[PDB]
Amino acid sequence: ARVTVQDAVEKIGNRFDLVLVAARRARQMQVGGKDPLVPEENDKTTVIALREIEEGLINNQILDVRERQEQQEQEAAEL
């Protein structure tokens, strides 16, 4: 769980950018099938998003390249 966000702000060197990245990730996991990259210890998707930011598993570049990758793989479903 989460009481202080300070460790996640050192990975994304801002607080406003951290809020935006973690909100994008939390909406991915909340409305979207995208499962967490960390063990979901009964946490809400905002806190799981932050716990992923804190381990370097999520940032703006990572989410961007995943968007590109899965977008190519599901728009190239040309049959």
Burial environment of residue 10 by CB neighbours within 10 A (0 to 12, 13 to 18, 19 or more): exposed
Q: Pick from 5, 9, 43, 60: which binds another protein (CB under 8 A)?
A: 43
Q: Pick from 47, 57, 62, 63: which binds another protein (CB under 8 A)?
A: 47
Residue 1 near another protein by CB under 8 A: yes
CA distance 23 to 27: 6
CA distance 12 to 15: 8
Name the segment binding another protein (CB under 8 A); options: 6-14, 38-46, 57-65, 66-74. 38-46
Name the segment binding another protein (CB under 8 A); options: 8-16, 17-25, 36-44, 55-63. 36-44
